[PDB]
């Protein structure tokens, strides 16, 4: 509808795949080469389905900060025959608050979904399904099951991936440029 949805559409059309694990279907952001992200609660194994293609997982790393606290972000390298468009120049370098964010999801269940979630708070600490988690973004939209892995953008920046909610609020793990230096 506006420049917010335009930026979000540009990311979804070129930089997402449908990831399937034994824990279900997830929106999965491709960042560069064969490197993508997914919520840690997807429990990525040795094999994953990517757009329904059986894919060997070359590497998978569950990120924690230097306080040894969960970040809820898994970085996956896929044995895929095609590279992603490099979108690392769209990642923020520092933790921050934002205005006018969109949350975008693409699964079997929720194809081409875009939600204007509005203002995003640098929330910080969250007890997420009982796990102490850091670097959480918070937005006041009643997000639901099927949206985890959903991409959070502002015009010009990819800022996080949806990892849960409490029925009033939704929660995203921050993406930072320093996660994807090669």
Per domain, the residue ranges of the chain are 1-15+85-182, 16-84
Residues taking part in catalysis: 41, 72, 148
Rounded CA-CA distance 3/9 in Å is: 10
**CA-based angle 140:141:143, to the nearest 5?**
135
Cβ 137 vs Cβ 160: under 8 Å:
yes
Structural biology method used = X-ray
Rounded CA-CA distance 120/148 in Å is: 17
Cβ 175 vs Cβ 55: under 8 Å:
no
Burial of 102 per CB tally in 10 Å (0-12, 13-18, 19+): buried
33 beta partners: 84
User: How many CB atoms lie under 10 A from the CB of residue 106?
Assistant: 21
This structure's resolution (Å) is 1.7
């Amino acid at each position: 509808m506006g420049p917010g949805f335009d930026f979000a559409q540009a990311i979804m059309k070129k930089n997402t795949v449908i990831a399937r694990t034994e824990k279900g279907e997830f929106t999965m952001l491709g960042v560069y080469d064969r490197v993508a992200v997914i919520p840690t609660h997807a429990s990525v194994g040795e094999i994953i389905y990517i757009n329904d293609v059986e894919t060997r997982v070359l590497d998978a790393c569950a990120l924690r900060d230097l306080t040894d606290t969960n970040l809820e972000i898994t970085i996956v390298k896929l044995d895929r025959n095609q590279k992603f468009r490099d979108i690392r120049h769209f990642l923020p370098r520092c933790e921050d608050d934002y205005n006018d964010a969109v949350l975008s999801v693409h699964t079997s269940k929720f194809p081409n979904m875009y939600i204007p979630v509005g203002q995003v708070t640098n929330y910080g600490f969250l007890n997420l399904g009982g796990t102490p988690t850091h670097r959480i973004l918070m937005y006041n939209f009643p997000t639901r099951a099927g949206q985890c892995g959903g991409v959070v953008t502002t015009t010009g920046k990819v800022i996080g991936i949806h990892v849960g909610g409490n029925g009033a609020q939704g929660f995203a793990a921050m993406l930072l440029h320093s996660y994807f230096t090669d």
